[PDB]
Ligand binder design. Structure first.
Ligand SMILES: N[C@@H](CCCC[NH3+])C(=O)O
Ligand SMILES: N[C@@H](CCCC[NH3+])C(=O)O
Ligand SMILES: N[C@@H](CC(=O)O)C(=O)O
Lengths: 447, 445
């Protein structure tokens, strides 16, 4: 009967926040394992340093990190002892940072970055202790065995499960355990990280390893609703959603956590509750491997202001590699493609704003357009809104009738994507229409 | 401006009888004064084979093959010796270039080699006509088809062509009928060069564009475009005029007929491209025009049966960059052309372009490389059904006027939004016919 709880950077951004999170932990007596990320902001400063910065900039980042740590220390009733550990860690970072300025590598990047999670974990244990709450510190690296793919270490499930039993379970029996997420260690001892989503990933991995009954992921959203309540107030809360559906949930990956991270939990049938740390009472949503009787339609997603790139060229006809090159170009220009539809001599795609760097004002630079125009007539359309129906049995080898199609009859559709998934059916409409479409589509499918 | 250009592909000049049948079509219209020809059927391939460099043994089996085709036509002539030595001469040249190839190869050498195919057929065709007391002269396109040095895919210099055409081609056309080669050209430095697949059709267009031709006739193996495949819905009517933009989006136009890219010079210069059948000129054809009058919401529906649907699933493509870049890379490397593509959040489904690929397209080798980063699922026997038309898409979207059309059917995949002229989807084979027949009935019949 072990529950694992995970908190992201904001939940542990500072003193006040950490208490707030403690409040939530203590709330449930079954949570005995807590996985934390680095205090908000920290990981980024650490990565900036790991790149190697000249002394000046190097310390602006360093001090930044310090300021964050002490803002939490100072509020403790006995900052003395703790301050020591942090001071020690902070100095270590300063040196490694000096090193980075001379020699860099993914491996060194990991050891550096990892300190972020070590500090917050240490501090969080003090906050709880300061509440006459028995809680100990634990180094996940004692259990999180990964390969040496520094930056994106692959967890060794078997090892993890074993080591977890040898060192983690015993401590959990003594009581509450507070540990880091996102980090791990390779066989040869070097520190490693698990890439974006790491902490969420960890909470699942540890959960899988300890046959936990459930895993709570505290985010900035009360869970998923049938639709954006800001659009249709009648929007009801979805209690249980299937993994397969959640993954296809647009506003889930974007506004919530990444589906890949929960895989260890789902594959081991351990419910993942997704709630909001800024409002625990509101309840949340359970992401399960399978749900009792899955509805034909489970929810409508809305992603507004999507840019439609249409690529036209008689030369793609019967040619090999035209797209191989176009997407190559797109990748090189730091862009993630979301939707894609094709005609005989033309292809239209939308930019994935979430997986594309916000470095600038517009994703489509004349640089990219020139590279593209070089092999097709580029036409652009912005202000389109993506509307998506997440559900079940929306597609079958024998096709699907109007049961699934008639739903989109009353609207002017500019693009349709259907067939890829039996859980998703999305299309594009002009922004102006976006809300009426959603409101009407919801009314007849859920209201 | 009453200059009409006519082009005939390899089949139309495959042998003697064929060439005469083509001539019959030429003389059919008194306005055709320029005739663009491909090499006789088979030849171009043997030439390419040779250009690769073959050991003496195989090198001559292809060599001899080429010869046998040329003489099959020579022997049927009344006064053969009037051109026997020219062929003989060209054939010898080929034999040595071929020996050379076996030692040193390059696109450049490959063009000079293959070009001989068109040189021969054109020379023979001219004798067929003269043997008919028909005044017709031979002309080397290369005196006017100026291109860059991109051997294998030379880019025509329109300006140059337009100029040179006036200086050397127009003058000859005035004297009477002119028979010239297609697919080949020459670069500034004099080297022979080719225009890539479709070349002959491409030439017919460029020459037409350069001579302000009133029309261009491309004789193929189909009597033109119909509302649907006649073998599916007999009520299928023949389409007189089709807009280029529409034609390009016709699945079966590119497949059977010819490639849209090739007609570009014609369309951009508003020169109607008549597409008919050489195996039956009576049946009439279709006019591919830049624009037409009262373009219909629906112009026709196409059917491409037995398509293979490849579905790629992987939670890791979500928010990742380059997932597709790699997938398509792999696909290219394995000589596969992707036709249709549709996406969901964590999966992508595409169909293989049977025409631009080529025992089985999906080898365990490719599936291995692909499985490496996603769950591959395969479905074959699907039929592509496409609606070709106009205004099928707009910035503000389209209502049920265009959608209601496919309500009555069980659809397995839909692609819409890329083009305002096309709307296609997939359905299982079994359904294919009924779908087409019913769709046809309420849209055309
Ligand atoms: N974003 C991925 C493709 C995702 C396709 C499915 N929506 C890429 O840029 O390669
Ligand atoms: N056949 C091209 C893409 C064309 C897509 C639209 N018909 C390729 O596989 O690179
Ligand atoms: N801290 C890691 C993992 C996580 O936040 O879940 C990251 O920045 O991606």
């Amino acid at each position: 009967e072990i529950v694992v709880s995970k908190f992201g950077g904001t939940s542990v951004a500072d003193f006040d926040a950490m208490n707030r999170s403690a409040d939530i932990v203590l709330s449930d007596a079954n949570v005995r394992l807590v996985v934390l990320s680095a205090s908000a902001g920290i990981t980024n400063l650490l990565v900036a340093l790991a790149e190697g910065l000249e002394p000046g900039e190097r310390f602006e980042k360093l001090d930044a990190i310090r300021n964050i740590q002490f803002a939490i220390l100072e509020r403790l009733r006995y900052p003395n002892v703790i301050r020591e550990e942090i001071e020690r860690l902070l100095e270590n970072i300063t040196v490694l940072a000096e090193a980075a300025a001379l020699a860099t590598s993914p491996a060194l990047t990991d050891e550096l970055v990892s300190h972020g999670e070590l500090m917050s974990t240490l501090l969080f244990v003090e906050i709880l202790r300061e509440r006459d709450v028995q809680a100990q510190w634990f180094d996940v690296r004692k259990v999180m065995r990964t390969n040496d793919r520094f930056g994106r270490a692959e967890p060794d499930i078997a090892a993890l499960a074993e080591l977890a039993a040898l060192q983690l379970l015993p401590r959990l029996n003594e009581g509450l355990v507070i540990t880091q997420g996102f980090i791990g260690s390779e066989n040869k001892g070097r520190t490693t990280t698990l890439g974006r989503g790491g902490s969420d990933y960890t909470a699942a991995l540890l959960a899988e390893a300890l046959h936990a009954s459930r895993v709570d992921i505290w985010t900035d959203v009360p869970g998923i609703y049938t639709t954006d309540p800001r659009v249709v107030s009648a929007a009801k809360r979805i209690d249980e959603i299937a993994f397969a559906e959640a993954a296809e949930m647009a506003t889930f990956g974007a506004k919530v956590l990444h589906p890949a991270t929960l895989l260890p939990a789902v594959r081991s049938d351990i419910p993942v509750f997704v709630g909001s740390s800024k409002d625990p009472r509101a309840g949340g949503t359970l992401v399960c491997n399978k749900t009792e009787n899955p509805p034909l339609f489970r929810a409508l997603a809305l992603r507004r202001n999507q840019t439609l790139l249409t690529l036209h060229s008689l030369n793609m006809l019967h040619s090999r590699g035209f797209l191989a090159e176009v997407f190559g170009i797109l990748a090189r220009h730091n862009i993630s493609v979301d939707l894609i539809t094709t005609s005989e001599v033309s292809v239209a795609l939308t930019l994935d704003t979430t997986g594309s760097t916000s470095t600038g004002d517009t994703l489509l630079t004349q640089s990219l357009l020139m590279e593209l125009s070089a092999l097709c007539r580029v036409e652009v359309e912005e202000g389109l809104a993506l509307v998506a129906l997440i559900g079940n049995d929306l597609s079958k080898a024998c096709g699907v009738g109007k049961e699934v199609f008639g739903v989109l009859e009353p609207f002017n559709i500019r693009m349709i994507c259907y067939g890829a998934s039996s859980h998703n059916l999305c299309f594009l409409v002009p922004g102006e229409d976006a809300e009426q479409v959603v409101q009407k589509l919801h009314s007849n499918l859920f209201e």
